[PDB]
Amino acid sequence: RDILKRPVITEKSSEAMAEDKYTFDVDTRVNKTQVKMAVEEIFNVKVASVNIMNYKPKKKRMGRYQGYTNKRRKAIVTLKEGSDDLF
Amino acid sequence: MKAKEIRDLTTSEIEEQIKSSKEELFNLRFQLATGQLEETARIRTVRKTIARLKTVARERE
Amino acid sequence: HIKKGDNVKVIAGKDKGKEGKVIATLPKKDRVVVEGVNIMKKHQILETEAAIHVSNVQLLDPKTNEPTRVGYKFVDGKKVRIAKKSGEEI
Amino acid sequence: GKQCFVTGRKASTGNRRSHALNSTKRRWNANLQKVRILVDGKPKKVWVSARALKSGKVT
RNA sequence: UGAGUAGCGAAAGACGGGUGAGAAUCCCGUCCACCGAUUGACUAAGGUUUCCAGAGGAAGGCUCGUCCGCUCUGGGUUAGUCGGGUCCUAAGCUGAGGCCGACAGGCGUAGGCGAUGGAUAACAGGUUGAUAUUCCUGUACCACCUAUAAUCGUAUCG
RNA sequence: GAGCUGUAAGUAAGCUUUGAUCCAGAGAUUUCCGAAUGGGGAAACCCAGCAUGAGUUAUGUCAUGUUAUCGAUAUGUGAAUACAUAGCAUAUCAGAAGGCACACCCGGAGAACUGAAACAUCUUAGUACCCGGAGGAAGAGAAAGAAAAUUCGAUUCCCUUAGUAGCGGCGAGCGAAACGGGAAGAGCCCAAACCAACGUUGGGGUUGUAGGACACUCUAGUUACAAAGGACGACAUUAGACGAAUCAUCUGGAAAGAUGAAUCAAAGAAGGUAAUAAUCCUGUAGUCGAAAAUGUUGUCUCUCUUGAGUGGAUCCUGAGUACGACGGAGCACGUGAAAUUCCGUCGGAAUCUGGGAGGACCAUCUCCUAAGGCUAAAUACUCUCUAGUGACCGAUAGUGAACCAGUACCGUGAGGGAAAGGUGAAAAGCACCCCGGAAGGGGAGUGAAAUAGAACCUGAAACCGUGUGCU
């Protein structure tokens, strides 16, 4: 389903997109077997591998008040056919 | 107080919220990420239609 | 009471006795903006209209053009605004 | 959990007095004896005081 | 007030070229000096973004500072084989029914939890500003499923 | 009934007179932890069984239900041990658990410092702390009573009796009740005799002027006790709507102030508006109003229902109970001449010509009838909601906390704990020029005022500087 949240557009991810790799933001409590089936169901491609990782919340401040950002789970998808999962 | 005009039958109530989430919520949300999306009030409008389609379907029980 | 578009007379302040026309309404802070009243010079120099308290303006009766109070009559299912010391529906 | 199964007798509390009228706390226990008495099922051992063993009680 | 007084926390720096409003103190170069069973290379505990890049000089740095473990913005952690769980138990803890106890509760049987120990399938090379038995290249191993098999049937499995 | 997208300003994109936002009633959704309940665990995490379904050539993955312990009830149900009985398996259960207002109430258990000018009996004190069980109140409650009148008639609370009677190393100290005056105010159900049925369940029966059984003529619903399920109109609360009466001049940046003319009042409470307003605004007095939900009451329906006197041959009226000895406790009362009532141990009655009490005890008189149960009101307290009040505080005060406070911070932990309010009526929050890298400043503008420029109302003293008359 809508496991995916947003795509990741950075300098390192741009170098990944030249070799059939795509970086997304997924839900914090899903495994990469669900992410594998979610990509093929939406974009109609054939996935070959998924690697996934976690980042901790970061300390942030504005004015005097201090808080934390959201924790996130990042998935990198390797395809064997198809591309252009965004513009 | 809002405007509800969903007179559809059950077989058509299910498909209303499959089309309204596949493109009217998921396609509008990747456009805001990479950046192509003007007129951003569409996102909030669609989310309330999904809420409307579920309140009415549940009263049918 | 004082709604946008009406002709009003100022009864207190610097531009007192000067008729105008309400252009903006601020029900939260109880202020109205009247045309040609309390201009300000903002260094951005710019001339714009400032706001005055809603209790500083009074509505004018059409039959005499003298400031009057506003009542309600309950004629039909809807309400109308009557002018005191007169009978005309504002 | 030590009480008479029939009468409901149990321990009390009071004072121990010396000849000079000094006082300390003490307890008055009950003469509970472990006996087998006929109940609806198997006769199980229960605590029964000796006062309840007079005038004829099942054993 | 003491008073512009005590102190500035073990030690070798010198010159040239830059940047800059401002240079004993920042960057580059040369020479010289110190450790080297360690002032070198890994890593457990613990800390929790202090890591990288582009900018900044109010406060912190016992001096200065154009610089930073300090301020702003944007980034970075990828595993069937590595450590741990889907395996095992020591000490200890907890305990169905059970025993004891004014109440609260204490002790304990079968059963569980619990590594500092036992069992357990992958290596070499390359690459980025920030990751590497995790990414890429080449060559392997272990468990399970599906389709046909030479050979099977008192076979097989426990 | 016209703007709105919370602090909060910002820009961007939008909704709304086909009734946005907003206020009230009723619904639907409601991640994870936590009694936490499938198992485990270092809370907010990990790992499963079983039955249905989604997807796949198949495995691997996903979704929706359900699976703790104890207790009470139907059911199958060998043990040892013939029969039976422990154990075992499944089913049903708005059955239990935890939290809570560190207030009020009942019970279990229970100190010390202190006073006695030392201290042991005594006092602090049945207080603090701990544990259990509740309720909106709880506890008590229908005479084996108080007393001594020509008698009253369940319980609780207030006034007085009264610092009296009394208790006390007769020291320090402790300290009542009845009478009388008030608030509030109903009383009832069972066991036994006895009759009918197959030990059982029905009926009969509840007391002191002596009642009941047996035998003699015999018919107000009280759902707060007294027996327990429901349909039946008026109010109250939860959104709101109408609601009288003023103009002119002067000073000022601004009028509500001063000076003249008026008006309203079942409305001269209060708050705001550029300074001090009954008539500018929100209000006030007085009226009006409910889709829907809840509460309290009343009118039929509905549901139970046996009433009093005469006879007393005979029978019944609560047992290891009352009471006694020993050891303690509680009664204002410290064992004292200690009645009255509670616990542990050991003994242990009577039956209406009976039993108890009237402060050891006996006799006579008077009053009552123990050893079963239930019961509203007057009473106590405030975590709270609604509407108000004060010769109470005004930022070192008032709650620790007027401000992002049980927070910064400190400690392994239990736990301890601050400081910090104010521009202006209106941001109109200083366009532009000059010195500088910037901070900072000098003009020019805003404003009544900038020595009101966000380190902002007023701005004291300590302390630090510059310039000057006399020495």
- Contacts of residue C29, Cβ cutoff 8 Å, sequence gap at least 6: none
Distance of CA A73 to the CA centre of its chain: 7
Number of domains in chain A: 1
- Contacts of residue B6, Cβ cutoff 8 Å, sequence gap at least 6: B13, B16, B52, B53, B56
CA–C1' C2–F16 (A): 20
Q: Are A34 and A66 in contact (CB under 8 A)?
A: no
| Burial class of residue C70 (count of CB atoms within 10 Å of its CB; 0-12, 13-18, 19+) | middle
Closest-approach residue (CA) in chain A for B36: A87
**Beta carbons of A87 and B26 less than 8 Å apart:** no
Nearest Cα neighbor of A25 from A54, A63, A61, A56 is A54
DSSP run (H or E) holding A68: strand A65-68
Closest-approach residue (CA) in chain A for B18: A1
The DSSP-derived string for C26-76 is: ETTTTEEEETTSSEEEE---EEEE--EEGGGEEEE-TTT--EE-EEE---S
Number of H helices, E strands in chain A: 2, 6
Q: Are C61 and C86 in contact (CB under 8 A)?
A: yes
- Contacts of residue C74, Cβ cutoff 8 Å, sequence gap at least 6: none
| Burial class of residue A21 (count of CB atoms within 10 Å of its CB; 0-12, 13-18, 19+) | middle
- Resolution of this model in Å is 2.9
Distance of CA D15 to the CA centre of its chain: 19
Interface of B with A (CB under 8 A): 21, 25-26, 29-30, 33-34, 36
Strand-pairing partners, residue C22, are: C34
- Per the structure, the complete domain to which residue D32 belongs is given by 1-59
CA distance B15 to B17: 5
- Per the structure, the complete domain to which residue A58 belongs is given by 1-87
Nearest Cα neighbor of A43 from A22, A15, A65 is A22
| Domain range annotation of chain C | 1-90
CA distance D24 to D14: 8
Q: Are D52 and D32 in contact (CB under 8 A)?
A: no
The experimental method is cryo-EM
Q: What angle do CA A35, A36, A40 make, to 5 degrees?
A: 110
Number of domains in chain D: 1
The DSSP-derived string for D21-55 is: --EEEEEE---EEEEE---SSS--EEEEESGGGSS
Nearest Cα neighbor of A26 from A48, A52, A46, A47 is A52
